[PDB]
Design a protein around this ligand. Structure first.
Ligand SMILES: [Zn+2]
Ligand SMILES: [Zn+2]
Length: 431
């Protein structure tokens, strides 16, 4: 048995790993490269799509499913297994990617082909392919997210997919993995733990109370698949102590994802499921408003507070959020709250450095609004959580993280007596 990394090697996007065992070839994830690596989506996979026997998707994020249409475009016509939640979320994710994408590397017929081959596989259900047995484990990273357990030829491999941050409340705690001969694992935050969730939420509420009370606007850059909804969950469960104010989910996609949530109740934490059992949707705080078009979105730029505004892009690469910032950062009564990681060198990092001004949409904008970075809202396991999840596993191969961060985690693993390496693109690892 062997596993070949075809993405996320010393980087966080492009996840796709080819499992070769028992005359079978199983692709684990098929994600697109994003940001600076975007162009790579137009390059070859590095393997023959037509020779793949099956595909398993750990979750619906674009960096895990974004190249699937390309796989079918290149001839693949086999099944694609994923939890029902992932299957449903995927359709929204792929259709959106198809419409907003700059230089397309796949067309509508490819998306249609990909969606038509999806087959539901839930946690603990075993897939039998040749002499290979595969099953999903609870990853607690997104509704329907999982890690993969593959057993065959007397060997056991575990692919972590992305692991969640157990301190949070919306998703179930990730399950521990079985003892394995090899574990292919993400190390996104291999260098450090996150700030505790509880205190992060208290701080979040204090920022909203002060800002809304003084008539200002709380601006929140956010991604649309689960982070935006988690903030809505916090607002629903704790809004009672906040001043009355409209909450604008200024993201059609986040709106579409939210409408799907009631159908995905069984995929959330027990706490969330208990709320739904009481009859009310915990993801819809009072005053919620989903903003569908540009006209109303722009209007928010000049409308006075108090108001809470959630918008993408989550890492400020573009989107409605940029217009909100352009018009909101110069007012000291406003507050900018980051609830998701901002990579070095991006606009977010630039703002976090707190310079006197920042250039947005071709204009120098004075930075007067307060700025807060709440890393405790991270949806990835922190270094401490990563170490706990990997405890007792003899061999680990790291992927999905910046080299320096994987190295930091790897150092600790080796010191703990666990064999560890940083996966190299296209280089097979024996299990
Ligand atoms: Zn990922
Ligand atoms: Zn993810």
């Amino acid at each position: 048995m062997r596993i070949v990394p075809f993405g996320a090697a010393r980087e966080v996007t492009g996840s796709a790993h080819l499992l070769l065992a028992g005359g079978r070839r199983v692709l684990l994830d098929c994600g697109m490269f994003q940001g600076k690596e975007e162009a790579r989506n137009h390059a070859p996979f590095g393997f023959d799509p037509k020779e793949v026997d099956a595909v398993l998707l750990t979750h619906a994020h674009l960096d895990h499913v974004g190249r699937l249409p390309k796989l079918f475009r290149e001839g693949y016509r086999g099944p694609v297994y994923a939890t029902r939640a992932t299957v449903l979320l995927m359709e929204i994710v792929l259709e959106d990617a198809l419409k907003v994408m700059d230089e397309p590397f796949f067309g509508p017929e490819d998306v249609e082909e990909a969606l038509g081959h999806l087959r539901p596989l839930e946690y603990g259900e075993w897939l039998r392919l040749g002499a290979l047995s595969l099953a999903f484990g609870q990853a607690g990273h997104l509704p329907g997210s999982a890690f993969v357990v593959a057993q065959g030829e007397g060997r056991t491999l575990v692919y972590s997919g992305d692991l969640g941050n157990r301190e949070k409340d919306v998703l179930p705690d990730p399950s521990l993995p079985p003892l394995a001969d090899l574990v292919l694992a993400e190390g996104t935050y291999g260098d450090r733990p996150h700030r505790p969730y509880r205190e992060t939420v208290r701080e979040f509420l204090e920022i909203l109370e002060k800002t809304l009370s003084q008539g200002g606007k709380v601006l929140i850059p956010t991604f649309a698949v689960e982070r935006a909804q988690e903030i809505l969950y916090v607002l629903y469960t704790h809004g009672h102590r906040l001043p009355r104010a409209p909450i604008y989910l200024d993201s059609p996609m986040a709106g579409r994802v939210l409408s799907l949530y009631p159908r995905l109740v069984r995929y959330f934490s027990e706490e969330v499921q208990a709320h739904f059992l009481q009859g009310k949707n915990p993801f819809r705080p009072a005053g919620l408003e989903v903003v569908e078009h540009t006209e109303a979105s722009k209007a928010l730029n000049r409308a006075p507070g108090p108001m809470v505004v959630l918008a993408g892009s989550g890492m400020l690469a573009g989107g409605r959020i940029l217009h909100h910032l352009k018009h909101g950062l110069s007012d000291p009564r406003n507050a900018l709250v980051f609830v998701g990681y901002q990579p070095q060198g991006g606009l977010g990092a630039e703002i976090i450095a707190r310079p006197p001004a920042v250039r947005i949409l071709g204009e120098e904008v004075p930075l007067r609004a307060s700025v807060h970075t709440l890393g405790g809202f991270s949806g990835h396991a922190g270094q401490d959580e990563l170490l706990d999840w990997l405890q007792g596993e003899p061999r680990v191969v790291l992927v999905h993280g910046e080299e320096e961060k994987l190295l930091a985690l790897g150092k600790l693993l080796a010191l703990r007596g666990q064999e560890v390496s940083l996966a190299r693109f296209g280089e097979g690892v024996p299990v």
